[PDB]
């Protein structure tokens, strides 16, 4: 426990600490570290002088105090090498000749402390010799694993040297495939566990009652955003992403659901779930069945889909798969989807903000710059020098690093029937530089897509596969409105409805002069004018804006509905933005106000599920408007919310009904990881400063109301990213009894960390924006939704307890961190008692 100094300093009487305070030491409740500092009794002033302590001189321990004499020799060494004393001390060295050194060494600090009349090149000088010491860096927190960062540590659940960190929970990996800590049987899709709970960062407990209450407070603080920041009711959020499905406690898509259905009602009918329509990103195969199973609360990704598109069309020519999975991989097989309802909603995308962009940068970092690059840990200088060469392949022919045939890829994800399509900002504008600044080569077909879908894109959908010459092509025709079978003839507005895409993936495709591509267009498109809507050029792609812009280009259906196309209409293309073929067609004469789409109606729903994959889900599309690599504004007109603010009228034209914005958390600047090296937002430190203490990347608090206001001004709903997975870069640091752990929480076996101190940064101030709404809302919730809080949470066995609110994060809320460089050893033992020193 308990002085410290005795016969390793010649000077102890001068040297000893002030007095036995706490407030004389800079300790870590109220332990000591490596760098801690201390006030002594006197200070040698300028090397000269012993004068009384000034109640603000503190000095580093290690000036007068060391772990061994090993460790003191060491530090002799180093600071000689940085006082410019040219004199080392070999292995021989005894302990008077350290002494006398460590006294040189003092007697020249506070000469320089003086000279400079600062202490920060100490501080630094002090920090840099503790990180070569085998227990104070990386060495002893070693072997490192593929957790995104290297490795992580699990606090203990009972530490007898730091019971402010204990837990009765800390239940790690209860994603929704072993939600009960067992793998559901239901779900056979993916043999494995589903997920993981180290990810990044500080690792939040959401196993925990406590923090499963104030998960569900952010939840309600984000959907009352207006009501709570600008007593404004139109600058709410209405839907929510769901971040990290796969590596969190999925008790909280009980919770997230319940709410949903609770608050909002979305559980009634289609008018009030499409109203807060609500998404997962969770990448195992088991979670959509789950989500079916759960209610149908929120909609996920149809990966299948997205692998399909990815293979079929991304891919470089070699690595391309035939193109048949376009059809049949897919939540939905799209040979004939007649019905009015799908099975199960879901979202479509090729590209996110993360998946198949900042993949593509580390692989440009790995192939030509940093080919020992970890995970997605870039140095913005890294970042800067792959966009030059992954903005020089978007403009290729033949690409190495970024996807072929994007424009095919939202061909058939803004006509596909039975999914909800996201288009990445990404896709039309570039991942890099000013929001909106500039537009991508594919960002003309792309609008002409979404304003022809609202046209256009309505009823059943018949996709076919044909073998054509030394290749294949994929036809997939929507019938138009009113007409979910081919066989249905259609009122006027199915006339004029419908659309055909023809696409192949080889840019060899040549049709024999005997082959036939016959496209059935459906009962409703006998004898009919037929125009261009897209078509593959030798240099891209041109786009058809109007029945009069497509006058010559015309051709016509037999009398059996059928489009028929020879050689002299498709064959393979090689330009920047096709490699294969894309033909698009729509019927001639539709009303240049035609809108095919359908309100959702408020008639009950009766079978048990929230959401309904319809022809109302089916006219909506999702927007993720943001990308990682934005630029950071110059100006407050490139801030990322005035710009979507000056331009949510584009967003109306393309049918945008969904804007899924970037997460608006203030981000953290450690750069630790490529969010906080890009600060897009998932990197934060304050739950609930949504660019209130300072602005976010894309512009202050009252700049996010006006987008929301703007959109909403639009009916366009806008949807908020949950993300509680970690939180980074605390300001407190904290004393833990941690054990070294792979990401699933397995211990490391021959790790010095075994129950064992380890320093974190796990404290917040206590004085931001979570001290003043954390749990703020936890009595209103339960006033009006005490189901939420009598339920029994699956993991826990347990509801939630809202008897706790957080207001300053601690360790004892989460299940640990990241390995943060510190050592095995950072936390100071008396080397006789081999005990902890606690003041
Ligand atoms: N870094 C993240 O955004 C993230 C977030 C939550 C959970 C896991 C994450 N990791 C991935 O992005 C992965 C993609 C895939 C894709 C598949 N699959 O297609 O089957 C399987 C595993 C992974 S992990
Ligand atoms: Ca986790």
Redesign the pocket.
Known sequence: NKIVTTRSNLYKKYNQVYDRSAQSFEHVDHYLTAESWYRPKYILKDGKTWTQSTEKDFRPLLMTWWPSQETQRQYVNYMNAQLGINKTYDDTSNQLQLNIAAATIQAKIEAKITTLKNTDWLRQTISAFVKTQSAWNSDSEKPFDDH?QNGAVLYDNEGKLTPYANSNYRILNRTPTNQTGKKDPRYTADNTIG?YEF?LANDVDNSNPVVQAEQLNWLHFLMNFGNIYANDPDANFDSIRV?????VDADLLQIAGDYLKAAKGIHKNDKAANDHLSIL?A???NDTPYLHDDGDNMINMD?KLR?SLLFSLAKPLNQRSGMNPLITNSLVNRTDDNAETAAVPSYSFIRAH??EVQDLIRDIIKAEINPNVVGYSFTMEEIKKAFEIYNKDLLATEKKYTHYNTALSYALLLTNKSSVPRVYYGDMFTDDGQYMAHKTINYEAIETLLKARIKYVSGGQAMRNQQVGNSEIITSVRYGKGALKATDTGDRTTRTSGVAVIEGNNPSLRLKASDRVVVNMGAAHKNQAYRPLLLTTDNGIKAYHSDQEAAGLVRYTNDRGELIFTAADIKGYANPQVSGYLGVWVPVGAAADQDVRVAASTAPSTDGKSVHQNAALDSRVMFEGFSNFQAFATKKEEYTNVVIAKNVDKFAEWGVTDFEMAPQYVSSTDGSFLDSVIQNGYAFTDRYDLGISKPNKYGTADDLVKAIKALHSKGIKVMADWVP?QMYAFPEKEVVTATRVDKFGKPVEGSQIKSVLYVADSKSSGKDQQAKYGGAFLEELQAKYPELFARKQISTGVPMDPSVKIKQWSAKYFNGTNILGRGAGYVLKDQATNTYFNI
């Open positions: 995104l997920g990810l971040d990290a499905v796969d590596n990103e990448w195992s195969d990966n692998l993360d998946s997975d």
